[PDB]
Amino acid sequence: XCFXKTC
Amino acid sequence: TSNAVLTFIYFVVCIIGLCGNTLVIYVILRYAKMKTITNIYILNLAIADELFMLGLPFLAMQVALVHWPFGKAICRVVMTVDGINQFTSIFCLTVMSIDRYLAVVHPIKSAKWRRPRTAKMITMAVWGVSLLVILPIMIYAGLRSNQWGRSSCTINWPWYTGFIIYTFILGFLVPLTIICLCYLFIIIKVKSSGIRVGSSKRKKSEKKVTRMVSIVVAVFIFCWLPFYIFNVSSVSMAISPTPALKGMFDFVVVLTYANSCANPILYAFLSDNFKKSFQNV
Amino acid sequence: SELDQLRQEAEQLKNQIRDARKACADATLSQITNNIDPVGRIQMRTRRTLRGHLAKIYAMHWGTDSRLLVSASQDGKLIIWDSYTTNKVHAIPLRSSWVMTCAYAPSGNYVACGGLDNICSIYNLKTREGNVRVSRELAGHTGYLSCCRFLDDNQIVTSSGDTTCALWDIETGQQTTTFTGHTGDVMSLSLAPDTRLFVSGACDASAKLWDVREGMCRQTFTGHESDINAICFFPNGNAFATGSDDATCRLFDLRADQELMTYSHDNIICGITSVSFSKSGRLLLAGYDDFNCNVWDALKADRAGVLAGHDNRVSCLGVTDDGMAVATGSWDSFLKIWNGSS
Amino acid sequence: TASIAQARKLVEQLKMEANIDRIKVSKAAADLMAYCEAHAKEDPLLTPVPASENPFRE
Amino acid sequence: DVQLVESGGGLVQPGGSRKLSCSASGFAFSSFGMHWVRQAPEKGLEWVAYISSGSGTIYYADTVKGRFTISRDDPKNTLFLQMTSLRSEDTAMYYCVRSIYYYGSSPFDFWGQGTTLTVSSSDIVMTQATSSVPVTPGESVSISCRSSKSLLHSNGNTYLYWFLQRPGQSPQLLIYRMSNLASGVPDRFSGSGSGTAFTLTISRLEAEDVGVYYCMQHLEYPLTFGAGTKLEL
Amino acid sequence: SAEDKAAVERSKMIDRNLREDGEKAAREVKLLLLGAGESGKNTIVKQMKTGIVETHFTFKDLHFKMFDVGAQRSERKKWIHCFEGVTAIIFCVALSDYDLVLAEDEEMNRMHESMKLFDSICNNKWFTDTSIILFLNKKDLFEEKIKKSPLTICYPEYAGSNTYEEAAAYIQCQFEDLNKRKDTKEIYTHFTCSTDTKNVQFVFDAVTDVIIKNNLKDCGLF
Incomplete structure (x- = not known):
């Protein structure tokens, strides 16, 4: 899915 | 409309986060207090919060038409400076609260440690810890192109779940558990002095401007908490991709970039000198 | 019986000289100075910036080579600067940190300082060993001490806030003269270029000319409405400027016994903490206390310049022997060394 | 007799300043005007120094 | 007043090592830059080392660089020099010289009394072509020496340092920076010149102005003496 | 040059000695000691041990400077800055x-x-934020005086009550009524006792409360 600062 | 206006939200953060914050670098360098202890501790938080919003328009140019506009070595270094301008802007919130702790709770035993030579050595040392906690981004600054093609900027997985909880300890919980202690022990020793031992009727102060000490965590948790919740919800319980969640999760990134739009207001307006130095200039 | 005996006699005394001063007062100075040019925009840049004092700066004095300068600050350090390369030659530590004045000997061997400790210590710079040490402490004043000025290596005139100025012999260490005509606190001194006379200003709003060998008060000038804060001599030796807490400078001529030109503007009603003249005697430099120095022109009475680089108020300023510089110390711990640029 | 001792101290002193020959001001203050004409060129804050031989170059 | 008495040595074999110490007294030792200057038997002066005020800067001579080391001790007021693997070229009398540098100071004024050390068995040179002048007192004598570089620096001053070593004595500073007279010297001595050629002009000789008249430079390191102009009477 | 490089070396040996005496001089408490004449100023300096009589009395990890301007028979407007x-x-x-x-x-x-004096000192422009310790010096000497005559000769507008502990409600509040700028400075008050601590411990802990309210104003909060 989404991870860090984005998806 | 979900990607149009919310990308334009980034640009209003990009100015006041980088122009209302850059005047703090002006009033410290020129109209100085340049080597007191409270103005080099507030200078890194003016330096780290300045160029953090400069790493925002690259990510703002991502989320409009979502893809990486470069997808190259230079996109691998934008995510390498937004870990160094974001994990030392919230360690420099933590050293200022230990600075105000030693300035107020231990007013006599401070200046043997609180001297403006070694507060230029705490300034430089706090960037050194910041590089040792982001090298899992500097190594794996890779490429991925899963959702509807259009390759983006991210961290490429090899230790996948452990990244967010690594940034949850040193990014959110430890800078909050040190601020909320060092700003709580102030509120007891303002009442334990002015209302207990060497005292007068002026003990209103422990009830009125303790609003300003609790404003700072209300900003620090309205800006940085849901972004850490939206990743720990992302990791354990997988959900379906949603255009609204592509608009929700990309609207909680800019919430964290608002914390560095308050830290110039919250720290360099209420100060002694900068209340007059900005009034002078 | 005898109280109005010499009181009514005293009304004969001043009235014999009040209108007699007006008798030789044929025309205004601002009417016969229309003939000459104005000076022009005096834009001066802080070339060097001597930083290193850590409190307010209460006096500075230029050496006689126009290169060294001593500055006395309120944290109790006397510091000798190489004003060319902005570096410290000596940093003299003081026994009492309440310095209100300092001075450079015209031979360069000696520096003196005094203040609220009622003594004017002198310090031997060029000695056999490495350090600056104190030669004589000149005790004998009972007020605070506001100006030390060296005549030569062995005579130094000091004014004080017991309404007395004195002459000294540093070799013996005691007053050879005392100059008692002032009723209020004496704040300033200015030795003559020929070093035979001096003028000193007081908190009685009157300033007086003295003779160093005679010992009597040679002249007396009124004209101000509050305390006189600073006197320097003109490069003639025949004139002086009094900067007062009435926000005004005024210019007296000793042979004309009365004032000539008054330097004020309506927008400034704060005091005047220090005065110095320039090599022509064309620029009156005066360090005010709305935090900036004003460079008055002595013949036209206009603000010819402003030196606005100072945070707090300008407490001292001195111009060199050849006219090459002007330092201004101030209460924010810097000396801005100015110079005009082509 | 203390206030009369200062009084003849005050009376005879101003008569020692009453004998001062004073010159009229357009004769006297013009000699302050005539001073600068021999020292106008030699004052560096007044007239611009040649910047090379100027010791204060930044 | 001032006294710089040094010691240590007298016979050390080649391949050996000997430590020198210069004990200072009577002056503010931690304000002064120290030197060592050696002098071979029947030969001239030549510079050895340096420590600036507060141990900041240390220069050496290229003949001894790495073999010698210099150390100062400001609470004890004692200057050291440790010398390793001694050559026969290291046979000289060693002098402890003080020096102070601020605006207007006279460096190299006080020299020590000296310590002999014998063993058993690019940069500017200063040229004094003259080696012997037999004269009578009462008349003017000009000593002159030449430089490779123009000693006039851009700040304004010209670093040549005249000296005088009386027989059986220690050198002493006559004219520091080619023009100015030092402390204790009479007014009869004077120096002048411009750029590369200089002259030391005594106006009237005495019975104690007889000796060897050295010249040193101080424009850049190393500091180099020439052979002296011996005077006779 | 090469001799100028040892001038510059000597000059930043001076600079690192100014900035080591100036960090050990912002760590000491400076207290102007004032009074209206026969005021028991000699009594207080007796506890804590021609121009300035600078007294140092450092006792609890905190260096203290106290500057007696007692002999200056001159204008106070000229040296009070x-x-x-x-x-x-x-x-x-x-x-x-x-x-x-x-x-x-x-x-x-x-x-x-x-x-007359306190209203001039407390409302002086150099002491707008300089918080003024007050001492009431003769405590057990005017208990004898209050019996013989009340405090109606001084102020005839007082209430009454003729008591030693009444006079705080008369005299002490009458001084702190002259504190015009009440936002910035806080007048401390004491009754000078002959005990060892409680006249000098009070100046210690009521100057901690000036120090702490100086830091809190300097570190943004207050």
Whole structure:
């Protein structure tokens, strides 16, 4: 899915 | 409309986060207090919060038409400076609260440690810890192109779940558990002095401007908490991709970039000198 | 019986000289100075910036080579600067940190300082060993001490806030003269270029000319409405400027016994903490206390310049022997060394 | 007799300043005007120094 | 007043090592830059080392660089020099010289009394072509020496340092920076010149102005003496 | 050059010695000691041990400088800016001068020669934020005086009650009524006792409370 600062 | 206006939200953060914050670098360098202890501790938080919003328009140019506009070595270094301008802007919130702790709770035993030579050595040392906690981004600054093609900027997985909880300890919980202690022990020793031992009727102060000490965590948790919740919800319980969640999760990134739009207001307006130095200039 | 005996006699005394001063007062100075040019925009840049004092700066004095300068600050350090390369030659530590004045000997061997400790210590710079040490402490004043000025290596005139100025012999260490005509606190001194006379200003709003060998008060000038804060001599030796807490400078001529030109503007009603003249005697430099120095022109009475680089108020300023510089110390711990640029 | 001792101290002193020959001001203050004409060129804050031989170059 | 008495040595074999110490007294030792200057038997002066005020800067001579080391001790007021693997070229009398540098100071004024050390068995040179002048007192004598570089620096001053070593004595500073007279010297001595050629002009000789008249430079390191102009009477 | 590089070496040996005496001089408490004459100022300096008589009395990990300007028979408007940056101002008033007029010009009973002073000191522009310690010096000397005569000679507008502990509600509040700028400075108050601590421990812990409210104003919060 989404991870860090984005998806 | 979900990607149009919310990308334009980034640009209003990009100015006041980088122009209302850059005047703090002006009033410290020129109209100085340049080597007191409270103005080099507030200078890194003016330096780290300045160029953090400069790493925002690259990510703002991502989320409009979502893809990486470069997808190259230079996109691998934008995510390498937004870990160094974001994990030392919230360690420099933590050293200022230990600075105000030693300035107020231990007013006599401070200046043997609180001297403006070694507060230029705490300034430089706090960037050194910041590089040792982001090298899992500097190594794996890779490429991925899963959702509807259009390759983006991210961290490429090899230790996948452990990244967010690594940034949850040193990014959110430890800078909050040190601020909320060092700003709580102030509120007891303002009442334990002015209302207990060497005292007068002026003990209103422990009830009125303790609003300003609790404003700072209300900003620090309205800006940085849901972004850490939206990743720990992302990791354990997988959900379906949603255009609204592509608009929700990309609207909680800019919430964290608002914390560095308050830290110039919250720290360099209420100060002694900068209340007059900005009034002078 | 005898109280109005010499009181009514005293009304004969001043009235014999009040209108007699007006008798030789044929025309205004601002009417016969229309003939000459104005000076022009005096834009001066802080070339060097001597930083290193850590409190307010209460006096500075230029050496006689126009290169060294001593500055006395309120944290109790006397510091000798190489004003060319902005570096410290000596940093003299003081026994009492309440310095209100300092001075450079015209031979360069000696520096003196005094203040609220009622003594004017002198310090031997060029000695056999490495350090600056104190030669004589000149005790004998009972007020605070506001100006030390060296005549030569062995005579130094000091004014004080017991309404007395004195002459000294540093070799013996005691007053050879005392100059008692002032009723209020004496704040300033200015030795003559020929070093035979001096003028000193007081908190009685009157300033007086003295003779160093005679010992009597040679002249007396009124004209101000509050305390006189600073006197320097003109490069003639025949004139002086009094900067007062009435926000005004005024210019007296000793042979004309009365004032000539008054330097004020309506927008400034704060005091005047220090005065110095320039090599022509064309620029009156005066360090005010709305935090900036004003460079008055002595013949036209206009603000010819402003030196606005100072945070707090300008407490001292001195111009060199050849006219090459002007330092201004101030209460924010810097000396801005100015110079005009082509 | 203390206030009369200062009084003849005050009376005879101003008569020692009453004998001062004073010159009229357009004769006297013009000699302050005539001073600068021999020292106008030699004052560096007044007239611009040649910047090379100027010791204060930044 | 001032006294710089040094010691240590007298016979050390080649391949050996000997430590020198210069004990200072009577002056503010931690304000002064120290030197060592050696002098071979029947030969001239030549510079050895340096420590600036507060141990900041240390220069050496290229003949001894790495073999010698210099150390100062400001609470004890004692200057050291440790010398390793001694050559026969290291046979000289060693002098402890003080020096102070601020605006207007006279460096190299006080020299020590000296310590002999014998063993058993690019940069500017200063040229004094003259080696012997037999004269009578009462008349003017000009000593002159030449430089490779123009000693006039851009700040304004010209670093040549005249000296005088009386027989059986220690050198002493006559004219520091080619023009100015030092402390204790009479007014009869004077120096002048411009750029590369200089002259030391005594106006009237005495019975104690007889000796060897050295010249040193101080424009850049190393500091180099020439052979002296011996005077006779 | 090469000799200039040893001038510059010597000059930043000076600079690192100014900035080691100037960090050990912002760590000491400076207190201007004032008073209206016979005010028991000698009594206070006796506990804590021609121009300035600078007294140092450092006792509890905290260096103390106290500057007695007692002999300066001159204008106070001309040297009072020397004490602008100062921590506190220890103002003394003897409480056993309440019916004691001055022989100068048949003046009022010396409390209008102290309220004359205190209103000038507390409302002075260099001491707008300089919090003023107050001392009431003669405590067990005017308990004998209050029986013989009340405090109606000094102020005839007082209530009454004729008690030693009443006079705080008369005299002490009458001084702190002259504190015009009440936002910035906080007048501390004490009754000068002959005990070892409680006249010098009070100046210690009520100058901690100036120090802490100086840091809190400097570190943004207050």
